[PDB]
C-alpha cells in the first residue's frame, strides 16, 4: 500500500510496456484485417 | 412484513410479468439469458 | 368570500353544460340553414 | 335519429390527435434531443405485437443514462412497461372493450416522489369521440372529490369542420375550492384532404392556431402560432421531407432559433440519425446524434427483415 | 461613422443567413442526392432486367 | 412609435398571415421539387 | 571529410517533424474540435499553388466565428495570409534560398495585444538538421538582446538513429538575466521502416516518448508517453483507419477519455466530417460536426476535379 | 449488501464499456461497409465490361 | 512615426497585396467581385 | 547574486555546445566500434 507518485509512475510504465508488447506481438497483426 | 412484501412486488415484478407474458406467447421460448440478452445470437 | 367563488365555478360548469347541449343541437340547425340557402 | 344518419357525418379524431400532423408528425419537438443516444429495440413476434427496447443516452437532461422498456399489443389490449436507472418504474396499459370504446391507464413510479398515475376511458361514436382522464384522484372524508380531472367532447358539425371543448377540474387538497378549466376547439379539413387547419382557445388565455398542408405524396409542411397583463406569442414554420431511405424535418422559429433533424436509414436494421438546433438571439447551439438497432427475436422474422 | 455601422450590420446578417441556409440545405443536399442515386440505380436495374 | 405588447402581437400576427399567404401561393409549389 | 561521405549517413527529419506522424498523422488533437464548423475553400491555380478558404464555426473556443485565408505557393516560395472577424491578421511566408536552406517568417497581429511575430531560419544537410527561431526580437539600448530565441540541432549518428538537441534563450525584459533551456532529442527508425520510435527530454524536466508502427498500408497505430515536487503524467494510445473513400481516427487515454473523428467524403467535391469524445472520469461529452466544399476556380480545373 | 455493490459496479462498468465499444465501432462499421459496397459496385462494373 | 504610419495601413493592406499577387498570376484575371465571391459562378 | 545564476546558464550553454561537438564526432567513433566488432 503506497498511493504515491512512484506508484502512479510505475502504473504508467506498466501501461507503456504492455502496449509495446501488444503491438510487437502478432495480436494486432491478426486483429489487422486481411483487407 | 407482508405489507412491504407486496410493495417490492410492484417494482421488481411488473416487467417480468410482461416478460413472462411475451415468453409464453413466443413460438421459440428461449432461456432467460437469451431473453435478457440484446444480442441476436439466438 | 369563498361562497362567491364556489358559485362562480357552479355557473361556469352550468355554462359548459349549456354549451354542450347547444353544440349537440347545432348540426341540424346548420343543415336547415343550408336548406334555407 | 333517421335524418341524423342522413346527414352522413364522420367520426373525428381525438383531441390529442387534433394537432397530430403539425405538432408531432411534421415538427420535431417530440423527436428532438441533445447529445449522444443509442437505442436497442427488438421484436420477438409481430402478430402478437411484442418487443423490448434498450436506450443509451448521454448529454440530455431529459433522457436518463440508461433505460429499459418493453411493450405488448394484442388485437384489443396494448401494454407497455419501462424501467430506468434509479429504478423509476414506468408502465401503461391500453385495453379496448370495443374498437370505439377503449380503457387505458398510465403508471409511473418515481421512487422518492408521490407516484402519479392517469386513467383514460375513451369512447367514440359515429360522429363524435369522448375522452375522460384523471390524474391522482383522492376521496376526502366527506366523500368529496380531490384531484385533477380531464374530459373533452368533440363533434363534427360538417364533414369538413369539427368543434370541441374540454372541461378540467382540479381539486388539489379540498381546503380551497377546485377550479375549472374550459377550452374551445376548432378543426377544419380540406374537401380533398390537401390541407388541415386546427385552432384552439385554452382556459389559460392561450390560443394555439395551426395550419397543415400536404403539398404532394412526399412533401408536406405546416404553420402554427401560440400566445399567452402578460402576453407572449411565438410562431414556427417547418416542413418534413419524407423518403423511403431518409427522413428530414426542418424548422424556422419566430424567436430567432433554427433546427434540423435527419433520420438516415443505412441498413434495414441500422438507422443513423442527426439533429441540431441553433439559436441566434444568444449565439449558441445544441447538437445530438444517434442510431437504432432493430433485430428480430426468431429466425423467421430475422429472415423476413432482410426479405 | 454610419458606413462602419452599415458594414457591420451587413456582415452580421450575411453570416447568420449563410449559416442558417447551409445548415438547412446540406442535409437536404445529401438526402436528396442519396434518394436520387437510389432512383437512378433502380432505373438502371429495370433497364438491365428489360 | 409604440414599441408595445400590441406592437409585438401585431408583428406576430402579420408574420403568421404572411406565412399563410406564402403556403397558399403556388410559389411554394414551385419551391416544392417536381420529384 | 572523405570517410564522412564513406559512412553514407542519411538526412534526418526536422525537429518539428520528429513525432510528426504520431502527433499529427496518427492522433487527432490538432484535427479534433467541438461544435458545428464549415470549411469553404476554393482553388484557382495549381502549378503555382493559389487557393482561398472560408471557415464558419460555432460552439468552439479555439475556432473563431468566421475567418478568411488565402495561400500562395510557387516552386520555391510559399505565402499565406489569414484574416479573422475582429480583424485578426496572421501570415506565414516561406522563401527558400535553396532546397536545403529556407527562410521563414510568421506574422500575427491581435490589434489590442502586442503583435507576436517569430522568425525561422533553417538549413538541412545530408546528415544533420539545424534551425533557429526567434520570437519578438528586440535589442536594448546597451546593445543586448531582449526576447525569446529557439535553436535546435539533429544529427544522424547512424542511418537508423538520430539524436539531437534544442537550445532556447529567453530574456523577457533585460532586467532579469535570460534563462537557457537545453532539451535532448532522440529518434530511431526500423531498418525496414516499419516502426519508428521517438523520445525526448525537455529542459523543464518533462519527458515525451512516442512510438509508431506502420502495420499496413491502410492502418497505423501509435503510443506516446508524456509526463512532468509536482510530477504528472499521461498516456494516450490510438489508431488511424485511412482509406480511399474516408479516414477514421480514434484514441484511448489513460485519463479515461475516448475519441472519435471520421471525415466522410461523400462526393469528390464534398467531404463531411464528424467528431466526438467522452470523458468517463467526468461523465461528460464533446461533439462536433463539419463539412468541406472544395471547388476549382476555372472550368479546366473544375473538369480535372470531376475527372 | 455486498451483492448490491457488486451489481452496481458491474452495471456501471458494463454501460461504460458498451458505450465506448459502440462509439469506437459504429463509424468504423459504416465506413468499412460503405467502402465494401463501393468495391462491390466497381467489381460488378468490371465484370460487366469484361 | 514611420512605423506608426506602417501600423494602420499594413494591417489592412497585407491581404490586398497577397490577392494582388494572385490576381496577376491568374490566367483569367476575373473582376474583384469574382475574387471576393466564394461562389463558383466564374 | 544573479551573476552566479548568469554564469550557471553560461556553463549550461557551453556544456550544450560541447555535447553538440561530441555528437558530431559520434558517427566516426561508432564506425570505429563497428570496426572493432
Author numbering:
A (entry chain D), F (entry chain L): 27 to 61
B (entry chain M), I (entry chain E): 19 to 60
C (entry chain K), J (entry chain C): 13 to 49
D (entry chain I), G (entry chain A): 49 to 276, 295 to 373
E (entry chain J), H (entry chain B): 86 to 135
Task: Reproduce the article's own wording on this structure.
As the main entry gate of mitochondria, the TOM complex is responsible for transferring ~90% of mitochondrial proteins from the cytosol into the mitochondria. To investigate the transfer process of preproteins from cytosol to the mitochondrial matrix, we captured the TOM–TIM23 supercomplex by translocating Jac1sfGFP to isolated yeast mitochondria to obtain TOM–TIM23–Jac1sfGFP supercomplex.
In the architecture of the TOM–TIM23–Jac1sfGFP supercomplex, the structural features of the TOM complex were significantly clearer than those of the TIM23 complex. Further analysis revealed that the local resolution of the TOM complex structure ranged from 3.0 Å to 6.0 Å. The rough densities of the Jac1 polypeptides were mainly distributed close to the cytosolic side of β-strands 10–12 within Tom40 channel, and the remaining densities along β-strands 3–10. Moreover, structural analysis of the Jac1sfGFP-engaged TOM complex revealed two preproteins proximity sites (PPS) on the mitochondrial surface. The PPS1 was close to the β-strands 9–11 of the Tom40. Superposition analysis of the free TOM complex and Jac1sfGFP-engaged TOM complex showed that Tom5 exhibited an ~3-Å movement towards the Tom40 channel in the Jac1sfGFP-engaged TOM complex, suggesting that the Tom5 might respond to the incoming substrates.
